């Protein structure tokens, strides 16, 4: 299947309390593998997955130096945007950036991207061509003109198509045992009563990797994604994920409803009923 390398960056000002908080968090697919946090006692880039021990001291030194550099540019960005939007110095503001590339199973580039947000709203984004930017408002239009006259798109393009891709391949190789494994879901169904002769049935899926999964409830072969409550697939603290999906049914008619689990580690999808 496809793989991705992504870096989540956040800068958050806190007037009266010192310098903005700056964080970088990197993921290979759905696994966190590196992080930087300015509020650590000794802010360094750190490994978050066991396989990253295969990198030497120079790797960590370089990443740390980048992060400290990036930190400062975002402190300046925060000030700049107060000007663009005519905002006072007394309020907290957030800049978020997502950058990444994705490859097929053969290691070839599928797509690269970089998008910025200010206070939780779209600011500026690299287009799918990797040559031009698109700007959500006139503040970001100023940024767009700056980056065009500087030719920034071209440098970023070279990173996404070259560096990002090659290091992603390297990580998938070094972390093979972890990143290309498949842990199969284990499922079960729970039962909860309700006021008016009705019952909640909840289908759980546990211990699976990768995160992509599909849970559905069925009555008479038709999928019931109408009255289905759901949580987003969520990390379980050990490298695996879990999910649940629930449906409200008539009391005494529980046996006519089936849960279906689809996962790449399930050659044939699971089918479960509620068992007394």
């Amino acid at each position: 299947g496809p793989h991705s390398l992504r870096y989540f960056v956040t800068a958050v000002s806190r007037p009266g309390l010192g310098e903005p908080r700056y964080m970088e968090v990197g993921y290979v697919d759905d696994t966190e593998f590196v992080r930087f946090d300015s509020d650590a006692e000794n802010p360094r880039y750190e490994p978050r997955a066991r396989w990253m021990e295969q990198e030497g001291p120079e790797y960590w030194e370089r990443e740390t130096q980048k992060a400290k550099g990036n930190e400062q540019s975002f402190r300046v960005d925060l000030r700049t945007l107060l000007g663009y939007y005519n905002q006072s110095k007394g309020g907290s503001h957030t800049i978020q950036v997502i950058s990444g590339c994705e490859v097929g199973s053969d290691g070839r580039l599928l797509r690269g991207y970089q998008q910025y947000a200010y206070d939780g709203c779209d600011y500026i984004a690299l287009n799918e061509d990797l040559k031009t930017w698109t700007a959500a408002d006139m503040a970001a239009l100023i940024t767009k003109h700056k980056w065009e006259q500087a030719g920034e798109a071209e440098r970023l393009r070279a990173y996404l198509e070259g560096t990002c891709v090659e290091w992603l391949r390297r990580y998938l190789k070094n972390g093979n045992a972890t990143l290309l494994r498949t842990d199969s879901p284990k499922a079960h169904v729970t039962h909860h009563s309700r006021p008016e002769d009705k019952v909640t049935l909840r289908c759980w899926a546990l211990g699976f990797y990768p995160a992509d999964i599909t849970l559905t409830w069925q009555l008479n072969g038709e999928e019931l994604i109408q009255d289905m409550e759901l949580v987003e697939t969520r990390p379980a603290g050990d490298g695996t994920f879990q999910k649940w999906a629930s449906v409200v049914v008539p009391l005494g008619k529980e046996q006519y409803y089936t849960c279906h689990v689809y996962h790449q580690g399930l050659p044939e999808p699971l089918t479960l009923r509620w068992e007394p």
Binding site: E24, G26, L81, I95, R155, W167
Partner: peptide, 9 residues
Amino acid sequence: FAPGNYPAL
């Protein structure tokens, strides 16, 4: 290998 430059806004 993280991006080493985020140009200023």
